[PDB]
RNA sequence: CGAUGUCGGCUCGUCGCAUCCUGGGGCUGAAGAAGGUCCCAAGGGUUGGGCUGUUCGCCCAUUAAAGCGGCACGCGAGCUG
RNA sequence: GAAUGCCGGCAUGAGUAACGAUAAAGAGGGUGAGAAUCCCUCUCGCCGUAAGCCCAAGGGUUCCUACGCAAUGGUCGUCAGCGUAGGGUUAGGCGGGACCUAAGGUGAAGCCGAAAGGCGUAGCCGAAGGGCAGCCGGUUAAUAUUCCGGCCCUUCCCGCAGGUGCGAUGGGGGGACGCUCUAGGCUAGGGGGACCGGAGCCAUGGACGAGCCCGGCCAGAAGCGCAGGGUGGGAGGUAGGCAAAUCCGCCUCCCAACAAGCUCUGCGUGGUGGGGAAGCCCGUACGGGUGACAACCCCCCGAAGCCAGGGAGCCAAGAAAAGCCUCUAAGCACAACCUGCGGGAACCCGUACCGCAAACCGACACAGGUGGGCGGGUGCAAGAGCACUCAGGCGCGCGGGAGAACCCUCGCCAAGGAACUCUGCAAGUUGGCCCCGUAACUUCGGGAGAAGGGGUGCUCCCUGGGGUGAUGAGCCCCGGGGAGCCGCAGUGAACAGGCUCUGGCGACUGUUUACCAAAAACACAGCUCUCUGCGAACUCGUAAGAGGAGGUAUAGGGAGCGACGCUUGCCCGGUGCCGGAAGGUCAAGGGGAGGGGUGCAAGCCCCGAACCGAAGCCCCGGUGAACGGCGGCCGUAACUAUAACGGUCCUAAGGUAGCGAAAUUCCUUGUCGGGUAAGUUCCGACCUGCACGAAAAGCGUAACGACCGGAGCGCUGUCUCGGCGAGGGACCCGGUGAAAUUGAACUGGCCGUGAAGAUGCGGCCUACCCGUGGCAGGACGAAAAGACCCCGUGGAGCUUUACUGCAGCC
RNA sequence: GAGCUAGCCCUGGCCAGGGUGAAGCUGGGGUGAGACCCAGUGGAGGCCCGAACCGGUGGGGGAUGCAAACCCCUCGGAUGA
RNA sequence: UGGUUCGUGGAGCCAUGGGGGAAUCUGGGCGGACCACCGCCUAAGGCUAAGUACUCCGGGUGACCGAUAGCGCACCAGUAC
RNA sequence: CCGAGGGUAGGGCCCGUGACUGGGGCGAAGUCGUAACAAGGUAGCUGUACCGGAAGGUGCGGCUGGA
RNA sequence: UGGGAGAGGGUGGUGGAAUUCCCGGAGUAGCGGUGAAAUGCGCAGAUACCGGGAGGAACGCCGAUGGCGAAGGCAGCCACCUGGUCCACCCGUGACGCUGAGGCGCGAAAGCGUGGGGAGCAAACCGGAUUAGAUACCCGGGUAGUCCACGCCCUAAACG
């Protein structure tokens, strides 16, 4: 059947990107938490040009 | 007149379509004056706030003239009468000698080629606009302003009118389509005649689809729902209500008057 | 009750006898034929349909007879539902 | 030592199930330490509106090459999408960006919110939509509309030369638009050819023939030709297009009304450029050479694609902005722009490979899911259907035997045909097209494919229409008539309704519980009630704001009923709602008669009765397509029987019409009638309606249904009642090799007993040790800390005239 | 968290081939003028048959599956809600 | 209404959203309703070290652990997945 | 070829019959009420509509076969 | 040819009286109603009176025992559009006539469909009296209908 993962680079970027997270206090805290944690990747790596 | 069909299909046996014979050879509209992009959307910034809206034909807005006092004294020739997707009535395309082209909402009896004009001057004829004062008591009228210089707001639906009843210092009394008795300021413009396309009420949609074409989504009964959804939801195999009939939001829907009492508008109203 | 799947049908049986038929027998209000009733006897047999989920029952057409009951109201790691 | 404990290790089931579509394999030769599995050749099979090509998304080195086989590959592996290394992705014209705007996002002005923040016309962002200039070939092991070859374009910048009042983010034009049906002419694509070009080939009885086989094209500036799209030309007047216009708009006269003329495309032709089979020969993992000075011509079919902004009809009435044209404003007119010609300038990112799939989403080389375009030929009425088959790509990464039970899928069957069963479930019968022929009923459309029939191949003869060609040959489409031939059978294979009669329910097409319910449930047109005069009612939001709606009573919200026909009775006592400037009750506040506390006192501080005080409630009315309700008991007619009639109690009033053993009837398989040999079902009646009834509508209704019930015809393996056969498994051999489960086990029957259902206890009976294929009675077998029941002063969702609050309204 | 699913908004695309034959046109008939009636033309419809596509009716299979919804046969819609 | 031990209590004091609304030393607040007396303070402007909290970081010590312990991580871990 | 007739399939007309049901006719002396004929004690009749155990009542317009 | 009477028909418009409801004034203790009453309305200010406003329907006097139309039927007034008909003159045609199966049109009231309207009246229906009982007569309310447009319906003591 159709499963739940339907990859889209634009969506992944607009949805979970560094700039989206930065836009709101909710998201800014996510970066803070991930930084303090020592996460190698703050936001998902969306590729291609 | 109303177009009628033979039952060559079920739902074609009741279906019924407007007569478009008053639609003069001018079916597609007029750029310049209108159209605008019209912005379909069944809801506010976010959430739906009027249920069951959506779908249905794309539209172009015809930006019509609801304040006729710009062109006081300037007459215009009625050039055409065309279909307007965004109202029950039809619209008149008129050419002002000025050059300017406006649409007026098209009254019953309006003929193409006719002369029409607005102002204190203005022969009392079908199509003309006047401040309510100079209009003879008892004449039927439409596109009436509520307060002066604020635009036509009463009687624009197909086949509607108001009748002038009497006067009272600065106000003339109106009898509105609903039957209400209203004091409306003398200085309010209103155009003589009834609205026309009066056979609009006689049309039978005929099937579900037609409803959808006009963007009317299926309306579901409270009875059909559940207690979470509606006061009428549940219980077992059908149910008669079990309380005084209500809206989904709990207010009673048979009888409960809802106009706020202390409206300052009150001292200008005399009926139902 | 940290689970013993619950009616009826189907398949497969097997057991009790307080025997439906078939074998033996006494009494009969047993002339004969046919019954009645009781004793002995389970070796084998105990049909096909209509209606109903039915068990059961009521009917149709037959039969030597169309027996009753137990086996977790036998049988769902055999089926049905 | 236990916690269905936690982590780790290792066992049991077990050499057991399985090895992922039943499209299929065989042999010869290589290579190699080692081949069913890798390379080659031959034969065989499968796909071919794909299982073949081309894009887009996603993926991200998987591409190509060399050397490798530990692991990954459900076996093997010399192979590989795997390991190591090296190479590979080339653009002014293709896509995206130094262009535009959509929803939406953002957001200076501004508005709002304890804070965080929420709104917000301008602007900006935002795209497979608008705009915009490259086609055909050739080369690489791997890139090419990118490189190279030919042919052809696009902007910019500077020059010259010639024109013109040039000139904006401002004005106007345009861009610019639906759905269905379509005409004319073309192209893509395809078929045929006695014609042109070709290596070859006469096999096995015949054929040296207008024989077989293969191929007879592509791109292309200017100019022409042929289609077709766009468009009127003047001159006055002018007060509108938010400054100004010569533009546009609106008047008024002239000449056009034609596409005549201007342009603009498409398609042919075009200087020139390029491609060019079979077969034969070669060494490939593949391409190369020859065929070749290849030929490159004529007919026919022909688009859903082009001309494109074509035409016609219809109602539901069908984006925006820029490029572009035009008009003028500041300014500037030694400027600038326009045309032609020269020279120069032309960036950023993507480009490999997979792409219906072993490279994407599904933990997997997963029988699932994935948007767009090309998708050949023949035949069957047509087609993207179906059978076979080009190009092309495959035989689905375990095989070899055997020929048991049983299972899956499939084929056939004597006689009987539903006796099967909850049910004709399943399976069969029927089946395409042409021609006759069709009932009740009906809303006059339907019901209709009703039902039921006949025809269907091939050969020869005659003959009627078109289409393309000229008014003809041919080539292609449709027809008619007459003789005749063959078989069991002519839509000879594949794709293709069983039918009727009668009820229930719902009018109908639709919708629904993704993953057990598709329905009589929802929706639905239509009916009615009610609210709402517009800063509307209502909805979201603390607000701002927003929807409603750029709507205005023929409109908008809420409720119920639910096409249509005929209709929808009585009760307003209670609840609700609506209406009542009287009265009772009623809070803060006003009011202070009167009383209290302290002071030597002026004073200060307390309570505090009249009386004045809203809404609400009380009270008075109204209102049922508002919540709802719509009786009991005795007696009476000249056979009995029954009760039109009467008496009486109670009610707010005592169910009308219509229907009724029902989707409603307990007693019930009520009782008659009908269908049957037999009928708890079905249909028709009766009415004693436990416990119908009129918009939670009542009674009907043609049509409609994967809805539910009853009946009959047809047909059958459903059955009597089985039998045979096929393939995929099961079985045996080689390879790889799980699982839940598991206190340990040396794990027999009977009759007892025991916590009441014993392999394990008693007595007796029986029984050598160990396997393999089978069957499922038991191990109260496995599986889920029962979901029923009860318990816990456990939890949630739901309701109300339970309590208490809050939003909200007054 | 709406990359699944539900709804709506903007912008595109897709629906082989066949049937049936509404209005309206045109001719004739009819009348005082009509209605209306015959053809012919026309090509309407939540119309019909049926692929793609969208479903999921009944049965079988599958049940440590190919699959945590699958497969085979059958069936519904297929110019529209 | 909040704060304080103070839950309307005899409820002051300290803050305050609403309404009314003064005075400048013989002016004003407080000492738990209120009043008298005796007293204590001087609101409606602001700044002010130290003594106190913490431990990302450096060091010292341990009747602290010793790779299932000790931080999740002694090991290229907030990694693989 | 045609063809008596047989068979299959579907219709048209007519007759008989059917639980139950509709009114009708007739049947010397049953019940209920009093509608009509006198001005019938509400003048009567009427087409239609609704309602009522029943005659009948009432709405609407009409008639003299009444005043 | 020339005249004349008429509620003959259709459309558009308009006038006053009266009834009801609303508003304001004034005004009180009863009004309505019948054979008699009661229901009902009224100190929440009825009835009666004055003023203003709204709305619908029907046209007093003229009016007749009258006129007109084929019948059904037609009545305030005005204008348009229009049918029939009688007189005079004897001017034209020249037998063109009468009747009429069918057909076709018209056709009171009630009724029906769609939409509008709704003052008064008023089936059904609710009450109050009467009665043995009243589903009637009489009284107080009252919905369809009565009105209009369009479409049906085709009945009558459609009677002279
Ligand atoms: Mg525009
Ligand atoms: Mg937002
Ligand atoms: Mg609904
Ligand atoms: Mg429900
Ligand atoms: Mg609720
Ligand atoms: Mg119920
Ligand atoms: Mg309820
Ligand atoms: Mg238990
Ligand atoms: Mg257990
Ligand atoms: Mg168990
Ligand atoms: Mg015995
Ligand atoms: Mg004996
Ligand atoms: Mg039993
Ligand atoms: Mg037994
Ligand atoms: Mg028992
Ligand atoms: Mg049992
Ligand atoms: Mg068992
Ligand atoms: Mg099992
Ligand atoms: Mg069941
Ligand atoms: Mg222990
Ligand atoms: Mg373990
Ligand atoms: Mg085993
Ligand atoms: Mg085995
Ligand atoms: Mg095996
Ligand atoms: Mg395989
Ligand atoms: Mg095959
Ligand atoms: Mg094949
Ligand atoms: Mg790699
Ligand atoms: Mg490779
Ligand atoms: Mg190699
Ligand atoms: Mg291997
Ligand atoms: Mg594998
Ligand atoms: Mg090797
Ligand atoms: Mg590699
Ligand atoms: Mg740049
Ligand atoms: Mg940009
Ligand atoms: Mg932009
Ligand atoms: Mg925008
Ligand atoms: Mg915006
Ligand atoms: Mg914002
Ligand atoms: Mg673009
Ligand atoms: Mg480009
Ligand atoms: Mg390549
Ligand atoms: Mg210029
Ligand atoms: Mg411009
Ligand atoms: Mg512009
Ligand atoms: Mg030979
Ligand atoms: Mg060419
Ligand atoms: Mg100007
Ligand atoms: Mg070559
Ligand atoms: Mg066009
Ligand atoms: Mg712009
Ligand atoms: Mg490339
Ligand atoms: Mg590529
Ligand atoms: Mg594809
Ligand atoms: Mg594989
Ligand atoms: Mg796959
Ligand atoms: Mg697909
Ligand atoms: Mg094709
Ligand atoms: Mg075919
Ligand atoms: Mg196919
Ligand atoms: Mg047989
Ligand atoms: Mg046979
Ligand atoms: Mg038979
Ligand atoms: Mg049977
Ligand atoms: Mg049986
Ligand atoms: Mg059945
Ligand atoms: Mg079947
Ligand atoms: Mg049916
Ligand atoms: Mg249905
Ligand atoms: Mg679905
Ligand atoms: Mg489901
Ligand atoms: Mg299902
Ligand atoms: Mg269905
Ligand atoms: Mg909101
Ligand atoms: Mg708004
Ligand atoms: Mg709006
Ligand atoms: Mg409404
Ligand atoms: Mg309903
Ligand atoms: Mg319903
Ligand atoms: Mg219903
Ligand atoms: Mg009712
Ligand atoms: Mg009541
Ligand atoms: Mg009430
Ligand atoms: Mg009341
Ligand atoms: Mg009230
Ligand atoms: Mg009060
Ligand atoms: Mg009954
Ligand atoms: Mg019942
Ligand atoms: Mg019987
Ligand atoms: Mg019977
Ligand atoms: Mg009911
Ligand atoms: Mg009801
Ligand atoms: Mg359906
Ligand atoms: Mg049926
Ligand atoms: Mg069988
Ligand atoms: Mg076999
Ligand atoms: Mg083996
Ligand atoms: Mg042993
Ligand atoms: Mg035992
Ligand atoms: Mg022992
Ligand atoms: Mg023992
Ligand atoms: Mg067992
Ligand atoms: Mg068991
Ligand atoms: Mg438990
Ligand atoms: Mg229970
Ligand atoms: Mg308790
Ligand atoms: Mg026609
Ligand atoms: Mg069609
Ligand atoms: Mg259809
Ligand atoms: Mg279909
Ligand atoms: Mg406190
Ligand atoms: Mg104080
Ligand atoms: Mg103090
Ligand atoms: Mg003190
Ligand atoms: Mg102090
Ligand atoms: Mg550790
Ligand atoms: Mg260790
Ligand atoms: Mg750890
Ligand atoms: Mg009969
Ligand atoms: Mg009889
Ligand atoms: Mg009498
Ligand atoms: Mg009388
Ligand atoms: Mg009488
Ligand atoms: Mg009556
Ligand atoms: Mg009468
Ligand atoms: Mg003469
Ligand atoms: Mg009539
Ligand atoms: Mg009438
Ligand atoms: Mg209607
Ligand atoms: Mg009255
Ligand atoms: Mg009365
Ligand atoms: Mg008469």
Topology summary:
The structure is cut from a larger assembly and holds chains A (49 residues) and B (272 residues).
Chain A: H1 9-16, H2 18-23, H3 25-37
Chain B: E1 3-4, E2 16-17, E3 36-37, E4 60-61, E5 76-82, E6 91-96, E7 101-105, E8 115-116, E9 129-131, E10 140-142, E11 144-145, E12 152-154, E13 162-168, E14 171-175, E15 181-185, E16 189-192, H1 208-213
Antiparallel strand pairs in B: 1-2, 3-4, 5-6, 5-8, 6-7, 9-16, 10-13, 10-16, 11-12, 13-14, 14-15
Chain B binds six RNA strands through strand 3, strand 4, strand 12, strand 15 and helix 1.
Region (Disordered) (chain A): 26-49
Function (chain A): Found on the solvent side of the large subunit.
Family (chain A): Belongs to the bacterial ribosomal protein bL34 family.
The residue fraction in helices of chain B comes out at: under 10%
| Major sheet size, sense and barrel closure of chain B | 6 strands, antiparallel
Strand content of chain A: under 5%
Q: What's the oligomerization state?
A: part of a larger assembly
- Mass-distribution shape of chain B: globular
Secondary structure: number of strands of chain B: 16
Structural class of chain A: mainly alpha
The count of DSSP E runs of length 2 or more, i.e. the number of strands of chain A, is 0
- Class by SSE composition of chain B: mainly beta
């Amino acid at each position: 059947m159709k499963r739940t993962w339907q990859p889209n680079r634009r969506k992944r970027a607009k949805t979970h990107g560094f700039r989206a997270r930065m836009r709101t206090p909710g998201g800014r805290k996510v970066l803070k938490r991930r930084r303090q944690k020592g996460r190698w990747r703050l936001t998902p790596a969306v590729r291609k040009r | 007149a109303v177009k009628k069909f033979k039952p060559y299909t079920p739902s074609r046996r009741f279906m019924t379509v407007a007569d478009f014979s008053e639609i003069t050879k001018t079916e597609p509209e007029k750029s310049l004056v209108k159209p605008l992009k019209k912005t379909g959307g069944r809801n506010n910034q976010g959430r739906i706030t009027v249920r069951f809206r959506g779908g249905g034909h794309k539209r172009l807005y015809r930006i019509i003239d609801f304040k006729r006092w710009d062109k006081v004294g300037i007459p215009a020739k009625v050039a055409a009468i065309e279909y307007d997707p965004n109202r029950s009535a039809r619209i008149a395309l008129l050419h002002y000698v000025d050059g300017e082209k406006r649409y007026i909402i098209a009254p019953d009896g309006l003929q193409v080629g006719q002369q029409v004009v607005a102002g204190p001057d203005a022969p009392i004829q079908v199509g003309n606009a006047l401040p309510l004062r100079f209009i003879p008591v008892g004449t039927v009228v439409h596109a009436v302003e509520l307060e002066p210089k604020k635009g036509a707001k009463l009687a624009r639906a197909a086949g509607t009118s108001a009748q002038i009843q009497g006067r009272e210092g600065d106000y003339v009394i109106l009898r509105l389509p609903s039957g209400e008795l209203r004091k409306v300021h003398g200085e309010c413009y209103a155009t003589v005649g009834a609205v026309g396309n009066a056979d609009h009420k006689n049309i039978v949609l005929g099937k579900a689809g037609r409803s959808r074409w006009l963007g009317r989504r299926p309306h579901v009964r409270g009875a059909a729902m559940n207690p979470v959804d509606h006061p009428h939801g549940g219980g077992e195999g059908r149910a008669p209500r079990g309380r005084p009939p209500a809206s989904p939001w709990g207010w009673q829907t048979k009888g409960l008057k809802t106009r706020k009492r202390r409206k300052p508008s009150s001292r200008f109203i005399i009926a139902r």
